[PDB]
Amino acid sequence: RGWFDILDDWLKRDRFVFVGWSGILLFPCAYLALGGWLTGTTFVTSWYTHGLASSYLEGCNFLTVAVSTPANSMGHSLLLLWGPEAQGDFTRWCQLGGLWTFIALHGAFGLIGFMLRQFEIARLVGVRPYNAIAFSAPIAVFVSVFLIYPLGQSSWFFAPSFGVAAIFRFLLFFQGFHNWTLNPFHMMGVAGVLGGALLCAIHGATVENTLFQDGEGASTFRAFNPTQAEETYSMVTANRFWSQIFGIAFSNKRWLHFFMLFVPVTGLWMSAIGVVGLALNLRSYDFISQEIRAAEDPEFETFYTKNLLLNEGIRAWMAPQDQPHENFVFPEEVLPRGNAL
Amino acid sequence: MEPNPNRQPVELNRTSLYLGLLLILVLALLFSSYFFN
Amino acid sequence: MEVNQLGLIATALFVLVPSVFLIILYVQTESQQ
């Protein structure tokens, strides 16, 4: 009955927004990540780090604003406000890209916060901690992409910038430089995300079209009561439908719902692994056997060679403006271009 | 000396066999191109 | 095509070893019953 237990008592009171011990970490960090993003996209430029406008104040819209990465010359500096780069000056901190590390790092500890909260509430309410386990996939994606990837590269500059169009540029960078669509770890991720959305739709649609008539209304939502014992739709009829339509069906409700956890979580973990490889430029860029043949045989052509020509175009046409610290000057005559275009 | 009390049977049902063979075959189908390279 | 000669055995073992592991477990499950 000492202070620790009294504070525990209070953090765990049942209220509109539960706090918990995890809330101490979560709520500051989430609110600051989110405030940093809103603040930067409304007011802060990327002129000195990127040569880019990036705030509403500068004339950008919701698709083009971003909190952009620090200049390449910052390396992996934590860029603390009080550190030797900004030397405590808030304005220069904003201009050097300090809000990017601010958001990334508060964001990471908020994500930890959030998963601890799923653990904390799961334990108080008396349920198994699988929602927390599942959220490990979002964390793996975040750390591998926003932290591990730029740490293997030259600087935070090549991390994703927090913005809609900026993330589009990151997509296209990865195509042109890493040939990431060719990476089987991305392919397993694609299968897990698209497999998840399929499973989400097909499971909802099935439950809704094997409902038991449990009321008299044309709106079938009323005829459910969350404390009823009985299943609200027929697993037997659902199983027959799919067996006859598709060949096989689920027959075990538990396996079904576990598989819905399994499929998208595993896919995200796989894509995180491949990004860890790309941190090192360990790309699935080429097939050697294809290159040997094509080098010797100019009539040999596949969709694989056609896509590398596109990559080579992406690199040369975007690198000067996307990597300004490098001072790339490509005279017109050196740009790869097909006929006419 | 008593025989060990902690031993248990293990099982794999037929549906788990199908699911696992499918997983392996599809993984092979995906990765084989990268092994031949 | 000039492919990695060891790709064949990598792929053969990649398929065979984990499949054989599952078949072993399935068959001895059936003989319990």
Binding site: V236, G247, S251 | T15, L29, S32 | M1, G7, T11, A12
Partner: peptide, 30 residues
Amino acid sequence: METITYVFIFACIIALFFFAIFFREPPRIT
């Protein structure tokens, strides 16, 4: 050799489909 391998795996997947469908554990009620 690689063509044979690719086709062989695909063929095994089709055979598996056949057994998965027609030689499944039959779902039994209650």
